[PDB]
Amino acid sequence: MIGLVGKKVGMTRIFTEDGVSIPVTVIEVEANRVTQVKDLANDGYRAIQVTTGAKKANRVTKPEAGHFAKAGVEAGRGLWEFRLAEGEEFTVGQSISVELFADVKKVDVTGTSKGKGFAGTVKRWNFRTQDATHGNSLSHRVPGSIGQNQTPGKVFKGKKMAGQMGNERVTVQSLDVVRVDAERNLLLVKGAVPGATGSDLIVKPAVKA
Amino acid sequence: MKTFTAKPETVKRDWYVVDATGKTLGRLATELARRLRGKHKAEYTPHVDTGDYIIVLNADKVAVTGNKRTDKVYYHHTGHIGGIKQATFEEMIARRPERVIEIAVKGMLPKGPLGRAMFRKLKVYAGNEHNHAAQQPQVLDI
Amino acid sequence: SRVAKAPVVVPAGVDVKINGQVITIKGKNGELTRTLNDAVEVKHADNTLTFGPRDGYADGWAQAGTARALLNSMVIGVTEGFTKKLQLVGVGYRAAVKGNVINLSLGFSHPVDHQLPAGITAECPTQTEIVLKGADKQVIGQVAADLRAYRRPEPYKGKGVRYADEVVRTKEAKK
Amino acid sequence: MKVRASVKKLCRNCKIVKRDGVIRVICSAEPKHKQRQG
RNA sequence: GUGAAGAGGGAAACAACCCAGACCGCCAGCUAAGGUCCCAAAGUCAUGGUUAAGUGGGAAACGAUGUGGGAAGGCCCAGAC
RNA sequence: CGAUGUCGGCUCAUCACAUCCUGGGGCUGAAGUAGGUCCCAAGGGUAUGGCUGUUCGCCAUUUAAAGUGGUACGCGAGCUG
RNA sequence: UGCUGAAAGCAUCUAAGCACGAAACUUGCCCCGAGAUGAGUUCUCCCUGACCCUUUAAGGGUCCUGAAGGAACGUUGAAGA
Ligand SMILES: [Mg+2]
Ligand SMILES: [Mg+2]
Ligand SMILES: [Mg+2]
Ligand SMILES: [Mg+2]
Ligand SMILES: [Mg+2]
Ligand SMILES: [Mg+2]
Ligand SMILES: [Mg+2]
Ligand SMILES: [Mg+2]
Ligand SMILES: [Mg+2]
Ligand SMILES: [Mg+2]
Ligand SMILES: [Mg+2]
Ligand SMILES: [Mg+2]
Ligand SMILES: [Mg+2]
Ligand SMILES: [Mg+2]
Ligand SMILES: [Mg+2]
Ligand SMILES: [Mg+2]
Ligand SMILES: [Mg+2]
Ligand SMILES: [Mg+2]
Ligand SMILES: [Mg+2]
Ligand SMILES: [Mg+2]
Ligand SMILES: [Mg+2]
Ligand SMILES: [Mg+2]
Ligand SMILES: [Mg+2]
Ligand SMILES: [Mg+2]
Ligand SMILES: [Mg+2]
Ligand SMILES: [Mg+2]
Ligand SMILES: [Mg+2]
Ligand SMILES: [Mg+2]
Ligand SMILES: [Mg+2]
Ligand SMILES: [Mg+2]
Ligand SMILES: [Mg+2]
Ligand SMILES: [Zn+2]
Numbered sequence: 130m131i132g133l134v135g136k137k138v139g140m141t142r143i144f145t146e147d148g149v150s151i152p153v154t155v156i157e158v159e160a161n162r163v164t165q166v167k168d169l170a171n172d173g174y175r176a177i178q179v180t181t182g183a184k185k186a187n188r189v190t191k192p193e194a195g196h197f198a199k200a201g202v203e204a205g206r207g208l209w210e211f212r213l214a215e216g217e218e219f220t221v222g223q224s225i226s227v228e229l230f231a232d233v234k235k236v237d238v239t240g241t242s243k244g245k246g247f248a249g250t251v252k253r254w255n256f257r258t259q260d261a262t263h264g265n266s267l268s269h270r271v272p273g274s275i276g277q278n279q280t281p282g283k284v285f286k287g288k289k290m291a292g293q294m295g296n297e298r299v300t301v302q303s304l305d306v307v308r309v310d311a312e313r314n315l316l317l318v319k320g321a322v323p324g325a326t327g328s329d330l331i332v333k334p335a336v337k338a
Numbered sequence: 339m340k341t342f343t344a345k346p347e348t349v350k351r352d353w354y355v356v357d358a359t360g361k362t363l364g365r366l367a368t369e370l371a372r373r374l375r376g377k378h379k380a381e382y383t384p385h386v387d388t389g390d391y392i393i394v395l396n397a398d399k400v401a402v403t404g405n406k407r408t409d410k411v412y413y414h415h416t417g418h419i420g421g422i423k424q425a426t427f428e429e430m431i432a433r434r435p436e437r438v439i440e441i442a443v444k445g446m447l448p449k450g451p452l453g454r455a456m457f458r459k460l461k462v463y464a465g466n467e468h469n470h471a472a473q474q475p476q477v478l479d480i
Numbered sequence: 481s482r483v484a485k486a487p488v489v490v491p492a493g494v495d496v497k498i499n500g501q502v503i504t505i506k507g508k509n510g511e512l513t514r515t516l517n518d519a520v521e522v523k524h525a526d527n528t529l530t531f532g533p534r535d536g537y538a539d540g541w542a543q544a545g546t547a548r549a550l551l552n553s554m555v556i557g558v559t560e561g562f563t564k565k566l567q568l569v570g571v572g573y574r575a576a577v578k579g580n581v582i583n584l585s586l587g588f589s590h591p592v593d594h595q596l597p598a599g600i601t602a603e604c605p606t607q608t609e610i611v612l613k614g615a616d617k618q619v620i621g622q623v624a625a626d627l628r629a630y631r632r633p634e635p636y637k638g639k640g641v642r643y644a645d646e647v648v649r650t651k652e653a654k655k
Numbered sequence: 656m657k658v659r660a661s662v663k664k665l666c667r668n669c670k671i672v673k674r675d676g677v678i679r680v681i682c683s684a685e686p687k688h689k690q691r692q693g
Numbered sequence: 694g695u696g697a698a699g700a701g702g703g704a705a706a707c708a709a710c711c712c713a714g715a716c717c718g719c720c721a722g723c724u725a726a727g728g729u730c731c732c733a734a735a736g737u738c739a740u741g742g743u744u745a746a747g748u749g750g751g752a753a754a755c756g757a758u759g760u761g762g763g764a765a766g767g768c769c770c771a772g773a774c
Numbered sequence: 775c776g777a778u779g780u781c782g783g784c785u786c787a788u789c790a791c792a793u794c795c796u797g798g799g800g801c802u803g804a805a806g807u808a809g810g811u812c813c814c815a816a817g818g819g820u821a822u823g824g825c826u827g828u829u830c831g832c833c834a835u836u837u838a839a840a841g842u843g844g845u846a847c848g849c850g851a852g853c854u855g
Numbered sequence: 856u857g858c859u860g861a862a863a864g865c866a867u868c869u870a871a872g873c874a875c876g877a878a879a880c881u882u883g884c885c886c887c888g889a890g891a892u893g894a895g896u897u898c899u900c901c902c903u904g905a906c907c908c909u910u911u912a913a914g915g916g917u918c919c920u921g922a923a924g925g926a927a928c929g930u931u932g933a934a935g936a
Contacts, residue, residue, distance in 0.1 A: 273785030274849040542862035
């Protein structure tokens with residue numbers, strides 16, 4: 130089954146009658162509108178290409194606006210693409226609402242994580258700091274040793290070192306969907322999804338069930 | 339005088355279609371590498387690619403002798419430290435059957451830029467068909 | 481060899497179709513089909529099938545004798561059928577039949593259901609007894625081995641699924 | 656299963672069979688007699 | 694005996710091993726060890742066998758109805774196994 | 775020997791399998807539970823403290839288990855001393 | 856672990872044929888990923904002028920033209936050395 134493209138509005142809590150506070154992540158899901166249907170005869174696979182949101186008319190380019198004009202649909206802020214299962218099809222100018230998740234129970238939310246910048250191995254790879262006293266010379270947060278002596282004159286591939294942390298695609302699996310509010314285009318999932326506030330989210334039904 | 343050398347502009351190359359059904363792998367591959375090298379031509383020159391383009395079809399129906407179908411092992415290494423990998427013959431046939439012919443010929447070709455240019459002329463296909471009817475290829479029986 | 485030299489006489493009501501190395505034998509209990517080894521030369525002498533080593537092959541008489549005892553069993557399967565009996569030893573152990581799904585109750589926490597293959601028909605006279613009939617000998621023996629495999633018989637009390645004819649060598653728990 | 660370099664018949668009911676390149680002793684009488692050359 | 698103080702060809706590479714002792718030049722021929730499917734020069738040569746283990750292409754005591762060949766023996770159409 | 779920093783700890787590790795746990799089996803002098811032994815299996819996992827410079831070891835209390843080794847007895851142009 | 860089954864009139868899981876079988880293996884889950892030079896696919900957008908040259912060819916030059924788009928600059932960011 131396909132997913133929908135939303136946006137992280139923020140987090141809040143749903144007080145049940147029983148006295149339980151459910152930490153939820155509000156995901157507004159506007160009308161995803163299809164722009165292209167891909168198939169086996171032309172594209173080798175079955176998928177749809179959707180768009181959501183709006184865009185400035187002076188900023189949407191002539192190739193992109195011609196691509197939306199062929200589908201006959203308003204330009205959105207992006208283009209995403211969802212693989213189709215069998216027995217599942219959609220038309221081109223079709224709009225897809227959040228009622229698709231009306232009877233799902235768990236979703237997988239894919240987002241782009243927050244940018245931690247250039248991070249050290251303590252933060253990134255959870256390395257232990259060395260001793261803050263007892264003689265330590267300028268070596269409190271360094272990674273320590275990185276190899277062995279002459280046997281493989283070389284550091285191995287994938288050695289855990291410092292570098293860019295975050296700002297990348299991650300997927301949180303098996304999030305309990307709490308509420309599907311079709312009237313104001315919302316989706317409340319239990320827990321914390323990746324991404325900052327106002328960033329794009331991809332909500333798909335859970336594959337692991 | 340001086341010994342003739344072939345020239346890459348004046349050299350002519352031809353197209354051949356080989357059906358690989360039932361043929362032995364290495365005994366096919368050394369004739370393929372002979373005709374990609376150009377050692378069947380009197381204008382052979384070691385530093386010049388004078389061989390012919392060869393299309394090999396029915397690559398999944400190539401035959402090996404013995405128990406090599408279940409016992410021949412294709413090792414490779416991913417670069418990473420545990421990264422030794424391993425696939426048998428019938429696993430390579432199920433997964434990507436073109437690699438078996440490609441590996442045997444690449445092992446029988448010269449090593450270098452010219453041997454890689456000779457390998458670029460080998461065009462293998464698992465099926466019984468090809469998109470290269472435009473080059474009017476002749477059949478070759480090996 | 482000594483098995484392969486003795487020809488197999490096809491009876492009446494047994495239809496034989498020769499096709500290369502493939503032999504289809506029909507009858508009043510079903511049809512059976514088997515491709516022989518290429519080392520085997522088979523021919524029908526109007527009342528018997530004969531089985532000879534085709535030349536240029538190492539296991540000549542070995543493959544011929546295997547193809548002999550096979551088509552003998554295929555003939556008996558298509559004119560009489562085979563019947564394998566199983567019995568259940570143990571308290572609370574039982575069996576029930578639903579068409580081609582034996583519903584075993586072998587002292588587990590879950591019900592045991594076994595789907596029967598195509599040409600195999602089963603029947604429980606008693607709850608602690610299974611009688612299965614069919615054409616192919618390899619299939620009735622495989623199904624009986626599979627049904628035995630759920631409760632292989634314990635050597636201390638003989639408890640579990642056994643063949644109705646096998647002997648169960650017991651053992652006393654010493655101290 | 657005894658696994659040895661030297662496998663032998665231990666009783667009258669032992670039978671030496673070569674299954675898949677491995678010498679194996681099987682005994683219908685005693686299950687202790689079943690062996691496997693390795 | 695070679696190296697040291699000796700190059701060349703082969704043994705993958707490999708001072709001391711195998712063949713063989715470099716005056717110079719040649720886009721000439723024959724050969725040595727070693728080789729002749731391709732990398733990589735030359736037999737997918739011929740005839741007759743053996744092996745099924747990739748043995749070849751690493752190893753012992755010991756173990757085994759693997760298989761090929763040879764010579765002999767004791768039961769046996771009074772009927773063997 | 776016109777210099778290859780040699781114990782132990784710390785920090786990063788990585789490979790082998792002669793497997794400690796977990797997984798699959800065979801035999802048991804295997805009633806069950808719990809075990810003994812051998813075979814397959816290296817995917818992941820695999821204590822904290824007292825003493826002592828210690829590795830080790832003993833001891834205390836845990837844990838499914840507290841593996842055996844290689845790596846310049848891994849790692850001082852990474853720390854300590 | 857078996858089934859059928861000879862070789863070896865029996866027997867036999869194997870030689871022909873068939874079935875089951877583990878945290879290992881390949882998948883399934885997540886991420887990068889066409890510099891995958893074997894450089895792939897789909898969709899959309901843009902440009903539809905005149906002439907000279909000699910060594911005439913994937914040739915060189917003049918004038919007109921300057922598209923889609925991009926870059927630069929600026930305001931900046933839960934992006935960032
Ligand atoms: Mg940031
Ligand atoms: Mg610390
Ligand atoms: Mg200092
Ligand atoms: Mg400090
Ligand atoms: Mg190196
Ligand atoms: Mg070379
Ligand atoms: Mg010399
Ligand atoms: Mg040399
Ligand atoms: Mg020499
Ligand atoms: Mg050598
Ligand atoms: Mg000569
Ligand atoms: Mg010679
Ligand atoms: Mg040659
Ligand atoms: Mg020194
Ligand atoms: Mg020095
Ligand atoms: Mg055990
Ligand atoms: Mg082992
Ligand atoms: Mg481990
Ligand atoms: Mg795995
Ligand atoms: Mg301690
Ligand atoms: Mg104290
Ligand atoms: Mg190591
Ligand atoms: Mg050591
Ligand atoms: Mg050390
Ligand atoms: Mg160092
Ligand atoms: Mg140190
Ligand atoms: Mg250094
Ligand atoms: Mg059998
Ligand atoms: Mg039999
Ligand atoms: Mg299976
Ligand atoms: Mg687990
Ligand atoms: Zn025995």
